[PDB]
């Protein structure tokens, strides 16, 4: 069952104080923290990385603005089959329950990214924790 | 997207102490003020007028008898997509997540009204909120 | 109408200071007490005979031993549709907006179990609540 | 330090749905139930032994009345110096940040009652846990 | 018994999102809205007459200008001892467990606004619901 | 106004899970957080120096074995009067209202640190926050 996953606090969470409310609902569902990052201003490079496969998007560009207009947190936590529950407690926009269902009305200022695969997961804990 | 929607707050929200928690919801998921009114108690008129669409239904006047057993607010809302992302907080008393689905009990006492369409939206302001 | 079905906390409630969040879900959602036990440890015969059904499976011993770790309460609670609703207000680990869906993720240990259906609600009231 | 209190909640708290903000809280604070009961109606000896040292005061029938006028849960509670915190989490009408200090308003209908010695916690826990 | 006490919710309240939070808190200590309005912005009259006792103080400007800076509600609660304890329920930004000791920083911008005295509430009041 | 303040998140808010409900707390109150560390176990040196003031008491060993038993996150938080203003936000473990308060019982394991002075402020921010 135990996996880690990749979680980004975005910058509107800063600017509308949903910091605590987001990590909450994650740690009332049992997870545990295993790394951590405060990032005042996130360097542009690993934004994009984080982000490539939307590289040609048409939002990308926007997107990469927006997620260093301020601060973000980068965690890594650990938990029987957290990569999926996780995903879950994200939620969408649309269907309440959930973090972005309570807490967000944007396509792109959603509060939280949270890896949606073994292998994103892998590759988003590495960017954000190479050590 | 930005809409405009129409929310009653029920008597029995008020006969229950849920009136913040209610509004709270909505808050919380960025959706702003734009205007309020405090009815002590109702006309029978408005509130005939509000569901004019289920005048025929048996439970027709104990509805209109329940809406005006006791305090209510109407309120506008305004963000993205309003009318449809406030109905979905509001849901129904079978869907845990929601304001019906977490507070409510009851086909009748149900502590909240939200507009279900762009049609019935601007109509029900226009109800409540004339001028 | 009216209905009424038991609830246990489970000791992992106990365990992390889930008590009062998970009473309160069924609380808010108006729902009444009418008759309630905390049991220190509940007596091992009772707590084979709620899960008499489930004698025959796997988890069977695992699961009352678990039962059998720490506290438990026994509520009945009343209120219309009560046996259907607060099943779904229990709901399941996958599901967000419920209470195993926002505070549980184990098999289980998932905080909370309700009667499911019209008989085992009158069946479970008497295991717990046999005055009656 | 380790002691054990008594704590009644009382009529008003099933009245207004707010049984379990009141366990919430001293549940938080790490204290633990050794045992519980719950009253539909308490015979009125117990509560006229519970408030003996009350007999001769103008409000001690009111507060009779009252104290069987609806459900009532006894808690036998445990932890750390129990009796002088689960007070002071008590609290009163006039200081916020207590359980009657939020959520009460009334010289009689103050939601609970909370041993306030060591003797009169001996003397209440046999009262209501005679076992 | 009975008293009715006038509440300002300041715009700082709108700006950061705390509106239900605040009246929730003088929700659950069972104070009852007996009035409400919703001002986008309310008139600079308005305010200035509310805080008219202040009016040569050097903080007179500025505050009048922040409270039109956004919306405000204004609202009549009822309820026993309404003046004193929504006054203690407020209670100031040094006082944890207040409304301005968990939610506010700073001298101007403190969420909320509540009559200090019985005549002050019968003031406000007429300012803001004159219809009476 | 603005000054800077260092608070540790103690092991036993991991252990109860509180970790995300302290922060809270101290996001509501508008303070932002300016630079965070996770410790998965606290270098034991990094405790001691902490600590220092302590080295004498009959309570430091205990102490450093407890601060090292579990996981720790140092914070540094910025406002006006943060070092006042966090302080009385951690309170202590006699009134409610607070972190402390509301949460904790122990004279040991309270959930939190806080700096209680603008010279204890630079000093622990330096041991924590080198850089
Ligand atoms: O039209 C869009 C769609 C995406 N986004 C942002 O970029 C991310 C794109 O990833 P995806 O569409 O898969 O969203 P997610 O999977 O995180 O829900 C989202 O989180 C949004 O914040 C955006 O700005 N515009
Ligand atoms: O059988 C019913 C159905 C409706 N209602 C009331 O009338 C309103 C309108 O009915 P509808 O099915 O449209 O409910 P909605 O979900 O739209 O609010 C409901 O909110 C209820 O308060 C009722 O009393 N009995
Ligand atoms: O593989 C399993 C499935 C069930 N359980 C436990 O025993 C109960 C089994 O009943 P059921 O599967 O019907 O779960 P429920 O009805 O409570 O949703 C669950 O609540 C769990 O606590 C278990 O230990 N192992
Ligand atoms: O004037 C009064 C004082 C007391 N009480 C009730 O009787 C109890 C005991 O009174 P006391 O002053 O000891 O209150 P305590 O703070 O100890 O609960 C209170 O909790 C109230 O519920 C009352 O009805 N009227
Ligand atoms: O130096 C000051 C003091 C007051 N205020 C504002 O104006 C009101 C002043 O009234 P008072 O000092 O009596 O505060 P309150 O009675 O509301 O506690 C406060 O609420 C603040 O919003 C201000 O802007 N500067
Ligand atoms: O008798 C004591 C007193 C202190 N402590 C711990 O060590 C710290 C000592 O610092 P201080 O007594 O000044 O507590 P604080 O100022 O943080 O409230 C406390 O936070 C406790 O966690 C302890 O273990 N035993
Ligand atoms: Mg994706
Ligand atoms: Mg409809
Ligand atoms: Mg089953
Ligand atoms: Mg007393
Ligand atoms: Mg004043
Ligand atoms: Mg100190």
């Given at each position: ?7 980004l606090?975005?910058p ?25 990052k405060f990032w005042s201003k996130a360097p542009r490079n690993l934004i994009e990385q984080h982000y490539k ?11 990469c603005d927006?997620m260093v207009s301020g601060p973000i947190i980068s ?52 960017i954000w924790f190479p050590?």
């Amino acid at each position: 069952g135990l996996q880690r996953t990749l979680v980004l606090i975005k910058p509107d969470a800063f600017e509308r104080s949903l910091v605590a409310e987001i990590m909450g609902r994650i740690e009332k569902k049992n997870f545990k923290i295993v790394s951590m990052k405060f990032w005042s201003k996130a360097p542009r490079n690993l934004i994009e990385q984080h982000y490539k496969e939307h590289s040609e998007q048409s939002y990308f560009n926007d997107l990469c603005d927006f997620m260093v207009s301020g601060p973000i947190i980068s965690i890594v936590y650990e938990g029987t089959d957290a990569i999926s529950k996780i995903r879950r407690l994200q939620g969408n926009i649309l269907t309440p329950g959930t973090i972005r269902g309570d807490l967000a009305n944007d396509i792109r200022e959603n509060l939280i990214h949270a890896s949606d695969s073994e292998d994103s997961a892998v590759d988003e804990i590495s960017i954000w924790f190479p050590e």
